[PDB]
Ligand binder design. Structure first.
Ligand SMILES: *[C@@H]1O[C@H](CO)[C@@H](O[C@@H]2O[C@H](CO)[C@@H](O)[C@H](O)[C@H]2NC(C)=O)[C@H](O)[C@H]1NC(C)=O
Ligand SMILES: *[C@@H]1O[C@H](CO)[C@@H](O[C@@H]2O[C@H](CO)[C@@H](O)[C@H](O)[C@H]2NC(C)=O)[C@H](O)[C@H]1NC(C)=O
Ligand SMILES: *[C@@H]1O[C@H](CO)[C@@H](O)[C@H](O)[C@H]1NC(C)=O
Ligand SMILES: *[C@@H]1O[C@H](CO)[C@@H](O)[C@H](O)[C@H]1NC(C)=O
Ligand SMILES: *[C@@H]1O[C@H](CO)[C@@H](O)[C@H](O)[C@H]1NC(C)=O
Lengths: 50, 50, 49, 49
């Protein structure tokens, strides 16, 4: 839903990473969201028993 | 062909305050809800402008 | 007729800019106006407690 | 025995896409590098591509 001015092509967040990008053929604004997210933990009773 | 419009060389110029004027976009990237620090040849606030 | 023009001069300075939700620049701070403006420029907040 | 933290959940890319502007013409390689007369060093020429 971001509305880029005609002279702008890329968008950057506070960490300077690219967040919004204009498609050079359809002239529509698209957002880039990372693919990795969420924590993972493993519960083991000890490898010498199971 | 130009015929001199005025004989008076100069008049004493008087200055006003440029309250918070002359701010230009430093780069062509889009930022939302961002407080951004940039160094460039800006016009000083509350300056003397002829 | 009746026309007035104004001329000012630029200078190397550091600015802190407020960017709006729609991408417009709504406010900015001169970091060398006074100590209060300098502390706003360093603290990255338009309100100083 | 215990609970251990591991790496965060990763999702691997599945495709690769390229998005370039719709451009058809070829750049003037034959009138920049192949010109009949070049400019002098003191009055060099500048061209837009
Ligand atoms: C590159 O190709 C795309 C897709 O073929 C062009 O998109 C067209 O844009 C016009 C402008 O309104 C539409 O009327 C067409 O319907 C679009 N095409 C399709 C297939 O929907 C795009 O314009 C091309 N790039 C340039 C610079 O012309
Ligand atoms: C630069 O101009 C020269 C002409 O002096 C080109 O040389 C000719 O190129 C054509 C096309 O490949 C050949 O059929 C001719 O045999 C070439 N002439 C000679 C004498 O060999 C050259 O191709 C041009 N280069 C570019 C990049 O446009
Ligand atoms: C754990 O396994 C090792 C090797 O299999 C064994 O020597 C040790 O006694 C085991 N610990 C317990 C508490 O059974
Ligand atoms: C006025 O214009 C005339 C036109 O030739 C010029 O000769 C003259 O020097 C001018 N007066 C000035 C510059 O004071
Ligand atoms: C501009 O300079 C004049 C003196 O030339 C001074 O009286 C005036 O206060 C100055 N304006 C400011 C500091 O805003």
């Amino acid at each position: 839903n971001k509305k880029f001015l005609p002279f702008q092509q890329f968008g950057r967040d506070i960490a300077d990473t690219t967040d919004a990008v204009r498609d050079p053929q359809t002239l529509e604004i698209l957002d880039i969201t990372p693919c990795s997210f969420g924590g993972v933990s493993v519960i083991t009773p000890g490898t010498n028993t199971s | 062909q130009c015929v001199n419009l005025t004989t008076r060389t100069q008049l004493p110029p008087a200055y006003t305050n440029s309250f918070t004027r002359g701010v230009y976009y430093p780069d062509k990237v889009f930022r939302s809800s961002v407080l951004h620090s940039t160094q460039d040849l800006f016009l000083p606030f509350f300056s003397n402008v002829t | 007729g009746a026309a007035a023009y104004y001329v000012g001069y630029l200078q190397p300075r550091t600015f802190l800019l407020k960017y709006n939700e729609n991408g417009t620049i709504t406010d900015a701070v001169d970091c060398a106006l006074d100590p209060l403006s300098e502390t706003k420029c360093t603290l990255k907040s338009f309100t100083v407690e | 025995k215990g609970i251990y933290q591991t790496s965060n959940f990763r999702v691997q890319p599945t495709e690769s896409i390229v998005r370039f502007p719709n451009i058809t013409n070829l750049c003037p390689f034959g009138e920049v590098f192949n010109a009949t007369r070049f400019a002098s060093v003191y009055a060099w020429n500048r061209k837009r591509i």
